[PDB]
Amino acid sequence: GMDYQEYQQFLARINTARDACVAKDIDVDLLMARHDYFGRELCKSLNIEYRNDVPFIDIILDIRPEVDPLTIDAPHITPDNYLYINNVLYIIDYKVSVSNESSVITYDKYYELTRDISDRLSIPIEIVIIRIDPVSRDLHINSDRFKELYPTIVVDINFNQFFDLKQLLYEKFGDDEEFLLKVAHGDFTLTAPWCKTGCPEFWKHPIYKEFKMSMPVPERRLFEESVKFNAYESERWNTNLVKIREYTKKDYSEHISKSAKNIFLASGFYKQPNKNEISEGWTLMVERVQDQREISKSLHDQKPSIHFIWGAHNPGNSNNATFKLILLSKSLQSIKGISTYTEAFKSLGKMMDIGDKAIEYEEFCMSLKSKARSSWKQIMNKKLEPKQINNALVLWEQQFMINNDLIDKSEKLKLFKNFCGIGKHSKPKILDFDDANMYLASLTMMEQSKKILSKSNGLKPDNFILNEFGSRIKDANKETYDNMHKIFETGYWQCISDFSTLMKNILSVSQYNRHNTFRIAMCANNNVFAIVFPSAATVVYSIIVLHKEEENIFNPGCLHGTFKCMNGYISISRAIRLDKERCQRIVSSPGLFLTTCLLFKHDNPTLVMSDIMNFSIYTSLSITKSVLSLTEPARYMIMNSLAISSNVKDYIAEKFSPYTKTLFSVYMTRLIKNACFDAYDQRQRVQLRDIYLSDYDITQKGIKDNRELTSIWFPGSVTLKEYLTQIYLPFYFNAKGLHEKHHVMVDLAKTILEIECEQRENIKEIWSTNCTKQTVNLKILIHSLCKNLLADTSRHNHLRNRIENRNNFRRSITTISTFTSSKSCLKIGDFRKEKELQSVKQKKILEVQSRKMRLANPMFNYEMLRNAMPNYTDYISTKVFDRLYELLDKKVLTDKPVIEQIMDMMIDHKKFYFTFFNKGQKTSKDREIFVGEYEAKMCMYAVERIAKERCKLNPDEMISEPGDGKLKVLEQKSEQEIRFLVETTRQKNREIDEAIEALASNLGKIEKLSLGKAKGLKMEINADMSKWSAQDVFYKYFWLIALDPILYPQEKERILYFMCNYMDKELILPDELLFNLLDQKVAYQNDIIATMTNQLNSNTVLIKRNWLQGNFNYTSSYVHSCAMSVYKEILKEAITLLDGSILVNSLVHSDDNQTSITIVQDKMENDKIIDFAMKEFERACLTFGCQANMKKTYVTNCIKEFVSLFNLYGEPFSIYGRFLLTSVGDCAYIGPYEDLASRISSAQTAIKHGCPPSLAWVSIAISHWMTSLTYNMLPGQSNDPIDYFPAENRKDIPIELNGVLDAPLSMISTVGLESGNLYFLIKLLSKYTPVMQKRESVVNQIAEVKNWKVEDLTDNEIFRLKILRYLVLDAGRSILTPRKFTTAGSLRKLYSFSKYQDRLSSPGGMVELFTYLLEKPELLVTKGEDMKDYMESVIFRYNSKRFKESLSIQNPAQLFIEQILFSHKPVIDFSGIRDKYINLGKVTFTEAYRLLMRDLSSLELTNDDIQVIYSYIILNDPMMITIANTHILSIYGSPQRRMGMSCSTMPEFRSPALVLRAYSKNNPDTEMARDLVHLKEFVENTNLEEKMKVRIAMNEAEKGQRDIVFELKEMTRFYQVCYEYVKSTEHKIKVFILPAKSYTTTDFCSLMQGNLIKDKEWYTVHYLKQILSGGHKAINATSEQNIAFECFKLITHFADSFIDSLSRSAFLQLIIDEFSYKDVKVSKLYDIIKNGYNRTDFIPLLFRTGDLRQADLDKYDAMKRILIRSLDYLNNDIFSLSRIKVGLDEFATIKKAHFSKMVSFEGPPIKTGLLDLTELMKSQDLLNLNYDNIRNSNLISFSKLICCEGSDNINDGLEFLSDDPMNFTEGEAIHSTPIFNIYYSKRGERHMTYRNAIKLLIERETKIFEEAFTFSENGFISPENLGCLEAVVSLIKLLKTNEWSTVIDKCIHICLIKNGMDHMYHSFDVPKCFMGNPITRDINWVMFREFINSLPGTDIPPWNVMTENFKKKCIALINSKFETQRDFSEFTKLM
RNA sequence: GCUACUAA
Ligand SMILES: [Zn+2]
Known part of the structure; x- marks a missing residue:
């Protein structure tokens, strides 16, 4: 990136400097260094000459030197660069800054001065200032003339290397305040206050009294002093903050020492995991469980492991519906014996007989199905009536009637009372997992399963996944393709898949299952069936199987019993009562299952594939809560047991509680038990990879992948990375929402009231020194707050300004999302009237539904609560968007600034109320959410947000870092320590190491000095705080508000008042909990709920110190940071004692913490400091009121746990698996594209977190599978669209119609789904383009498109383009989407929805809204900026029947079944499809394909239509431009092993609602005026301004009068398509793990590409031209x-x-x-x-x-x-x-x-004696700059670099190679506790030249070749052998030159030139033996043939296989020459 | 609950 020379000198200047005024100048010189760096690279980007600080009076002399500079008056300015083109002077002054505030200052300054000579010379001078962002890297130019000149400018600039020098300079001098004084943009600028008047009540409040009670009297007054302090008044802001700092500095200085001096007090005794310590914990666990649960040893109390009984299919019997129905009928009638329900199962078969009348079943059923398939809505009013057939009364296809005559009155009872459990109405029942004869029983169940499931299907191993994605899996990793086969072949796959396909058909049936009906559900298996009994939502089902012989059936503990029939054996399973939510997962279980297996087996050959699948079915199908109790606690139980410092005993003795209800659970418990001990013995089996460090990051970092560890769930050895996966992954098998709300509410309530009572009775004192539970070291707190609050204001002055902006404090409440959102909200008051009326309605609907049930199969309160509970404070649930509307209409909220309203609400609202609702997530231990009043939401907003932007300043806080951004932070901090550890070790041991190499003579004296030296010590405290919310003093937070500098006195008074009321806050026990406790039936012994409510009197309990979970994250997190800041100071003073160095790094996230300590020792042993670190760790926590859970907290020498994101020894690694287990049931079930959209997004996420492509593609397959299974779009299904459309396979069918996603993964990862469309256009630009232009940029290939011919294309090729233009371009782009007939539902609770009723009821008022909305069309798409605007927007919203439904929650389980059942019914309205083709009712899926072709065949494809596609998709989006370029200019290079993984940030490929208001009327309300100009271009170029008006203007002449519906609906479409252009997307933090660091776009592209090709090797990428094109205006110069x-x-x-x-x-x-x-x-x-x-x-x-x-x-x-x-x-x-x-x-x-x-x-070719330097250029292996790599290289590699044209003396010919020294890589041990070797590049000596390397290679490698090609006991001499050599090298020229032969030739050549025998080799033709006549060149192939056979061959590596293949090749080939298949008639002509 | 008619 940057120059290396200047980096080294600037780094040295940071250490050399001591004074702050010297460090000041280093910051100033670094700015100019960055200033010129941007300019140097941009000048080449624009092709212009580089200049620096050139005077303006000289710039004119270059253009016109005829007028001297003295007379003509020029402005004396200093621009950077200049240019004169088109009679306009362009002036350049480039500068790098975050904001354009520094650019506009210099703009207007330049613009004003340049006008003095602009009119004087009559030549206009334009100011062109170029600014780039130093982190986001975006170009900003003010000149409009310059924009049209340069369409795209190359900016791959690196500032990443500049900020590294900044970190060093702000580390040494950053502590000193003298340096912070020099960095300022205003010193300190405090903005406008949010309040006008203070709070008197705050000083009077009893909590403020209780606060000062405990506090000392000097502190009492200090708190008064701090609140009243105004920062803006006193000379400096830090008057008070420093004043209180200097007071507490007495006790602080002493307490810092106190803790630090404990380094000598410590011993080598810390809570270390050991075999006995684990064993002891388990025993106390047994004692606990044996008391807390009812332990059983009986095998009849067990519950099913899986709820299914699989039995082998019967190919002899027919595989057809009607046949199976009667088969099972006779089978059930034929059951012979005597049990309990025998005669019941008998009559059930009797009540499903058809026999003779088989054909009547085929017709009657098809009429009913056809009747329903006609209508969009369900068939209402008409009565469904059965038809008597033999004995059965058929109601529907596989639906029958329960005939009360055919069953006995007693035998009907038995089936329903006892077996089905309809009308059946104290510790938990569990199995003893410590009984060897129970663990035996559990093991024999597995042995049984393996015995039956391992046996093959015998059916073709070809399902949709393999059929359609196998190809794309195999090319990624061939192993995984085979692994997949191995599964599909085995009965494991057929078992689960048939349970999946069966359950899908159980649910589909159960939906319309009545109370007098039993339904039959069959599967792909013709022996396996299910009977769905009448359900009293609840699914009541038995699996009925007709297995071959007796006990050829799989029972997991689900089977009731087997029975012998008249033909074979039939087995009926116990009646399972499951819920649709659970069943859904069972349907998607195969996807879960495949992933499980493939992920475990992936690239581990020591694992047993039949054992993985044996365990997997018991996980992927485990729906009971028994398993979660193992999977979750395991993760900590293993990691604790293999960590260094960790308390296992306590965790296993308290936190671990098995719920082994089922039989798999028992077996799985013992798997975990065992895995705990294996860890302890493998702690030292972990190794640390040789770190290849050579400045700026490291390749080959992290932990060594050695298969020495042991697996957990199955037999075999495992890698560490895989070990961790096997540890943490188990938990993601867990199922969401298994927790029964009835029970959760109780245990959640109980806990809150338990911990509040604890505080009420026991915890009385607030502050303390000795460190005690729920106590804060008040003196230490106040100081450490003061010290941090200083540094978090010195580092940013405009901090109060930053809070106002980024959190919209100034703007109206109606603008902020958190307030205008559709989230749950709590309303307080009196609703006793409507709550009673809403209840009694349902209490009648109860009787309504009961009355109807009494007729068919006679089987069979809020008022009370209010009457009983006196002190019941009445509440209700509402919406956050609704409350806001309510509070505005009743006028308490206004267009006043939100913070200004908050301040008033803090003092106005005085008593706070909170309610809890359960999350019931995958964890066995349930998590609560506290949701209270809207008034509260406003208060906490300010306090939390102020702390938010404060927390952001501190790099230690990580809640600030959104998304998976933490992953890279873990790395960047781990790498800093790995470097420091090395750097510091070399700085101390250098004096000692010198003597070691000096003597190494006697080696007995060396060991004396080698012991007494410095010792490295790294450690990571992978922490997890205990009760962050509940067991935490809230009083400490008062000080953070008090000491705060950027808060005004009148605000400080008000904030603390609200917090004073947040102590006397009441918890409302929701009614659903109170209803459980309403019906007493004998109360609890010690009723905590009743105790706190006074035998249940009030529904409220007051909560004090327990600040509610998640309400004060950032606040608590700053105090956490302040606590860990002390921990640093503690250790940093402790290590100055021993005299060494320490680097402590603390990452903070509310309750999850990670703190990395790196120490270089000299004196005491490593293990002493280990115990010392842990002591002060708890001390540090407990001095601030927080307590660390030593149970879950573990310490490693490498591993980093933080928010479950893992970083190893530099190498970052997350559990890729967890995201692959999402793509199964994560969607809203809307449409085929709509479902896939999110399921593929889950796959895209895996790739970010270092997932292999092979497994990535698996998720892509599964996703498609489920997607297509939802809507019956699978191969062979009903809606199968391959025959309906013109295409070869589903790769060519548009993904909008649902096919498959045919694209490369390197594209899907980046864009996804749209990729599949993009690839179909790139395929064309690689088919229909000439030899020229194809190798050039994509832009150039798009220009040729309009010079194609339409006739050339094919049926399929035409088909895509027609939809892509006329449908895809404008409409998350879908066409087929089923519409539902769903009802609005109960929306009575809402106030805002009542105001829609009143506006719909009263005439005129409705239209009045729509007419007002037409004059303000900004409020159709976005919510209002003002009260009226926002309010009336809320009412209009109810117009949409979808927004009315949006506020109601539909079950995805029910939603799933409703998309299966409504697939053959008319759901897709074609009106919205044909509209586009033109510019009936609903249409069935099948008809939707037909009716698409009838319209599609009519459309016309032109050479223009195609050019709109290549404009709107590719040329429009600069991202799509680059992605296409990357896949056309791609040059994949050297395949390499994934040695060193690194974190990488995704690069950049680039006013809202107020702008649309300035489009409605052209007048705005200066920068926003300029934004409209580019919006005008957008609407004019597309011409959607007229297109929209014409569509309306011709609709009023189509309909007649004035349709207000069309007036708006078409106007809204126009404003919504604006929204996406106007309101820009936020480039959120996306981190991808790649084989190296991605600095810039190009780097990212190359590494990304190469990471998603093969699993075994990553590839480095090249490009012909620059890929970073910007558009179609910008068509090479900068690419050349x-x-x-x-x-x-x-x-x-x-x-x-x-x-x-x-x-x-x-x-x-x-x-x-x-x-x-x-x-x-x-x-x-x-x-x-x-x-x-x-x-x-x-x-x-x-x-x-x-x-x-x-x-x-x-x-x-x-x-x-x-x-x-x-x-x-x-x-x-x-x-x-x-x-x-x-x-x-x-x-x-x-x-x-x-x-x-x-x-x-x-x-x-350039030939040099023997070498061909061209082939050295073209060589791969012999281009390394490492002496050893080339010296120890193969002859096969070198044998390419030879021609020689008859040379001699190979020594001489090698004169044309560099006789200069080469660079070797040396490695040394670092002498740390985690001992590793660093490898780096040295310069060698002299005799290590390129020549000597080649020579030594030649010598070593030729010696091996000679002895392999002797073929006699002589060598490479003896003409008797040279003849053999001649013979062997002769055939090589008279055969076929492939690749294997040529190597042998060239090797022989080399060997013969070396021995000085290159005076004959070239004169070596076929010997006389083979050549019959010398003149008549005839060849005796037979002889040659027998000569090849007569060659003995050698078995020495590496030539053993080489020669072997050669021989066979040459033989086969020779024999080929003869074998000429001549024509039968050919010879019959000649003779 | 969703649907169709009767009734206050
Ligand atoms: Zn030669």
Whole structure:
């Protein structure tokens, strides 16, 4: 990026400097260094000459020197650069800054002065100031004339390297306040106050009394003093803040020492995990569980592991519906024996008989299905009636009627009372997992499963996934394709998939399942069936299977019993009562399952594939809560047990509680138990990779991947990365929303009331010194607040200004999202009236639904609560957008500034109320959400937001960093430590290491000195705080508001009052919880809920110290940061004692914490400091009121846990798996494209977090599978659109119609779904383009499109383009989307929806809205900027029936079934499809394909229509421009192993609602005026201004009068398509893990491309031309130049690196003339360099050719006193093209380029004795700049570099190679606790030249070739063998020159030239033996043939296989020559 | 609950 020379000198100046005024100048010099750097590279980007601080009076003299500068008055300014074209002078003053505030100042200053001579000379002078952003990198130019000149400018600039120097300078001097004084943009500017008057009540409040009670009396007054302090009044802002700092400095200075001095007190005794410590924990766990749960040893109490019973399919019987129905009927009737429900199952088969009348079932059912398939809506009013067939009364296809005559009254009861459990109505029941005869039973269940499921399907291993994605999986990694087959083949896959396909059909049936009906559900298996019994939503089902022989059935613990029938055996499973939410997951279980297996097995050959799948079905299908209780606690139980410092005992003895209800759970528990002990013995089995560090980051970082560790869930060995996956991944198998709300509300309530009681009874004291639970070290707090509050205001002065802007404090409440959102909200008051009326309605609807059930199968309160509970404070649920509307209409909210309204609300609202609703997430331990009043939301907003922008300043806080941005931060901080550790070790041990190499004589004396030295120590505290919210003093936060400098006194009074009320805040127990406790039935022994509510009197309990979970994150997080800031100071004083160095780095995120400590020792042992660090860690937490959970907290020597994002020893790594398990049931079930959109987004996310392409593609397959399974769009399904459309396969069917996503992953990762459309257009620009222009930019290939011929194209090719233009372009672009008939639902709670009723009811008032909205069309798309505007927007919104539904929650489970059932019904309205073709009702999916073709065939494809596609898609979006370029200019290079992974940021490829108001009326309300100009162009170029008006203007003559509906609906479309153009998208933080650091776009592109090709090897990427094009106005000049630079940089270095010094000019001269780099002649590139204005870059090149003149030297010398003859003399002994002396010791620079580019050279061969330097250029292996790599290289690699034309003495011929020394890589151990070797590049000695390397290679490798090709006991001598050699090398020329043969020839050649036998080799033709007659050149193939067989061969590596293949090839080939398949008639003609 | 008619 930047120059290396200036970096080194600026780094040294930071250490050299001591005083702040010296450090000041280093910051000033760094600005100019960046200033010129931007200018140097931009001048080449614009092709102009570079200049610096050139006077304006001289700039005119270049244009017109006839008038002298004295008489003509020119403005005396100092511009940077100038240009004169088109009779206009353009003045340049480039500058790099974040804001244009510094640019407009210099703009108007220049514009004013330049006008003095602008009218004097009558030549207009334009000011062109170019500014670039130093982080986001965006170009900003003010000149409009300059915009039209340069359409696109190349800006791949690097500031990343500049900020590295800034970090160093603001580290040493950043602590000193003398340096902070010098950096200022106003010193300190405090903005306008948010309030006018203070708060008197705050000083009176009893909580403020209680605050000062505990506090000491000097502190009491200080708090008074601090609040009343105004920062704007006193001379400086830090008057008070420093004053209170200096008071507490007595106790602080002492307490910092106190903690630090404990380093000597410590011992080598810390909570370390050990086999016994784990064992002890388990035993106390057993005791706990055996009390807390009812332990059972009986095998009848178990629950099903899986809720399914699979049995082998029967191919002998027919696979057809009607047949199976009767088959199961007779089968069920035929059941023989006696049980409980035997005669019940018997009659059920009897009630589904058809027999003779099989054909009547085929018709009757098809009529009913056809009746429903006609209508969009369901068939209402008409009564469904059954038809008597044999004994059964069929109601629908596979639906029957329960006939009360066919079953006994007693036998009907048995089935429903006992078996189905309809009418059945104290510890939990669990299985003893410590019983070996229970663990046995559990193991035998697995042994049983493996015995049956391992057996193959025997059916074709070809399903949609493999059929359509197999190709794209296989090419990524062939292993995974096979792995997939291995699964699909095995009964495992058929078992799950048939349960999936069966459940889909169980749900589909269960929807219309009545109370007098039992339904039958069949699957792809013709033995497996299911019976769905009447449900009293709840699905009641049994799996009924007809397995072959007895016990050829899989029972996981689900089966009721097997039964013998009259033909075979039939088994019926226990009645399962599951919920649709659970069942859904079972349907998507195969996708979950495949991923599980593939992820585990991936690239690990030691694992048993049949054992992975054996475990996987029991996970992917496990829907019980038994499993979650294992999967979650395991993650910590393993990691704790393999960490260094960690408390396992306590975690296993308290936090671990198995709920082993099922039988898999028992087996899985013991898998975990065992895995805990294996960890302890593997702690030291972890190794640390050899770190190849050579300045600016490291490649080959992180942990060593060694397969020495042991797996957890199955047998085999595993890698660390894989071990971690096996540890953490299990938890993501867990299922969401399993927690029954009835139980959650109780346990959530109980906990809050338990911890509040704790505080009420036990915790009384607030502050303390000894450090105790819920206590803060008040003196230490106040100081550490003061110190940080200073540094978080000194580093940014406008801090109060930044808060106002970024959080919209000044603007009206109606603008901020958090307030105008559709989130849940709590309303307080009295609703006893409507709450009673809303309840009794449902209590009647209860009886309504019961009355109807009494007729068919006779099986069978809010008033009470209010009457019973006296002190019941009444509340209600509402919406956040609705509350705002309510508070405005009743006028308490206004257009007053939101903060100004907040301040008043803090003092107005005095009592705060909060309610909780459960999340019920995948975790077994349930999480609560506290949601209270809207009034509260406003208060917390300010307090939290003020802390937000404060927290952002501190780099330690990470809640500030949105998205997965933390991952890179982990890395950047880990790398800083790995570097520091090395740097510091080399700085101390250098004195000792010198003596070691000196003596190494006797080695017995060396060990004495090698012991007594410095010792490295790294450690990471992977923390997790205990009860961050509940067990935390809220009183401490009062001080943060008090001490605050950027808060006014009248604000400070008001903030603290609200917080004073947030102590007397009440928790409302929601009614649903109170209803559970309403019906007593004997109360709880010790009822905590009743205790706190006084035997249930009030529904409110007061919560004090427990500030509610998530309400004060940032606030608490700043105090956390302040706490860890102390921990730093503690250790940093402790390590100065021992005399060494320490680097502590703390990452803070509310409750999740990570703190990395790196120490270089001298005195005491490493293990002492380990215990010391942990002591002060808890101390640091507890001195601030927070307590650290030592249970979950673990410490490693590498690993970093932080928010579950993991960084290893530099190498960042997340659990790629967790995101692949999302693409299964994560969608809103809207449409085929709409579903896939989010399912592929989940796959895109995996790639970010370092996922292999092979597995990435799997998710893409699964996603498609589920997507197509939802709407019956799979191959062979109903809506299968391959026959309906013209196409070969689903790759060619548009993804809008649902097909497959045919694109490269490197595109899908970037854009996705749209990629599939983009690839179909790039395919064309690689088919329908000529030989010229195709190799050039994409832009050029788009110009040729309008010169194509339409007739050339094919049916499919035409088909895409027609939809792509007439449909896709304008309409998340979908065409097919099913519409529903859903109802609005109950919207009574809403106030705002009532005001729509009143405006709809009263006549005229409706139209009045729409007529008002037409004069303000800004309020159709965006919400109002003012009260009325926002309010009336809310009412209009209700117009949409979709927005009315949006505020109601539909179950995705129910939504899923509704898209299956409504697929054969008319759902897609064609009206909205045909409208576009023209500019009936709903249409069925099948008909939608037909009716699309009837319209499509009519449309016309032109040479223009196609050119609109290539404009609107490619040429419009600068991103799509580059993506297409990257895939056309792509040149994939060297395949390499993924050694070093690094984090990389996604690059850039680039007023809202107020602008649209200035479009409605052209007058705005200055910068916003300029924004409308480009908006005018957008609407005029597309011409959508007229197109919209014409569409309305001709509709009023179509309809008749004035339709207000069309007046708006068409006007809204016009404003919504504006929104996307006007309101710009925020470039959110996206981090991709790549094989190296991506600085700029091009770098990112190359590394991204190469990461998503193969799994085993990543590839480095090249490009012919620049890929970064900006549009279709910008059509090469800037793409050419850089090629010339690359070329000559490459050549000069290749020449001075490898070619002999003596003959380097000749080489260059030969290369320049007859050669070409990247299809451009090197001469033309040289001419481009010579005609350029940066010749100073290529001084040594120009001198060597004789194209260097004095002007260049004079310029070069002026950039950073010379003569030509001086150079001519000086460089008489320096022979290099990359370097010439331009002084006494100053050499010239050529700037080295990478050597992976030399392949892009194409010229005639240059032969040098024997070597062909062209082939050395074209070589891959022999281009490394490492001596050892080339010395220890293969002869196969070198054998390409030989021609020799009969040379001699190989030693002589190698004279044309560099006899200059090469660079070797040396490595050394670092002497850390995690001991690793650093490897770096040295310069070797002298005898390490390129020649000697080649020679040593030749010698070593030829010796091995000789002994392999002896074929006798002689050698490479003895003509008896030379004859054999001649024979073997003869055939090689008379056969076929493939690739294997030629190598042998050239190797033999080499070997014979070496031995001095190259005076005959060239005169070696076929011997006399083989040649019958010498003259008559006849060949005896038979002889030759038998000669090849008669060759013995050798088995020495590496030639053993080489020779073997050669022989076979040559034999086969020879035999081929003979074998000529002649025509049968041919010979019959000749003779 | 969603639907169709009757009734206050
Ligand atoms: Zn030769």
